[PDB]
């Protein structure tokens, strides 16, 4: 159910959702959470794809309740598909 969406807007919602924990540059520093470089291929048991990661964001995962440590999950169709598409670009 993936469909190549708006890297643009996915780059935004990237800043605002994940940069908060990840980095996506090739060498990154590993933040809160994993260095996603080359994450397209690379498994955790999860072969990533893109439809497969846009059922994995989809859910809110709080990690300390009260703090920003938590992500928000991405919950709009058309959010998961920007965000991929801007992801699977800029991850190699
Ligand atoms: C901190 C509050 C986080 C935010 C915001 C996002 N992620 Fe996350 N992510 C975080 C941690 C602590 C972990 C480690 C494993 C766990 O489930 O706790 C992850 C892991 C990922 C992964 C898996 C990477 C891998 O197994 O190599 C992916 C693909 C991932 N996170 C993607 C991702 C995206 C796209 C986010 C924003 C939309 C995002 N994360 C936010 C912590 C946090």
Redesign the pocket.
């Known amino acids: 159910e993936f469909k190549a969406g708006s890297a643009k807007k996915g780059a935004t919602?990237?800043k605002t959702?994940?940069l908060?924990?990840?980095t996506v540059e090739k060498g990154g520093p590993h933040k809160?959470?994993?260095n996603?470089h080359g994450?397209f291929g690379?498994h955790?048991n999860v072969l990533?794809d893109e439809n497969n990661?846009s059922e994995?964001?989809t859910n809110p995962?709080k990690?300390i309740p009260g703090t920003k440590?938590?992500?928000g999950g991405?919950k709009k169709e058309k959010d998961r598909n920007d965000?991929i598409t801007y992801?699977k670009k800029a991850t190699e």
């Open positions: 919602l990237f959702r994940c908060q924990c990840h809160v959470g994993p996603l994450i690379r955790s990533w990661m994995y964001l995962k990690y440590m938590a992500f991405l965000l992801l």
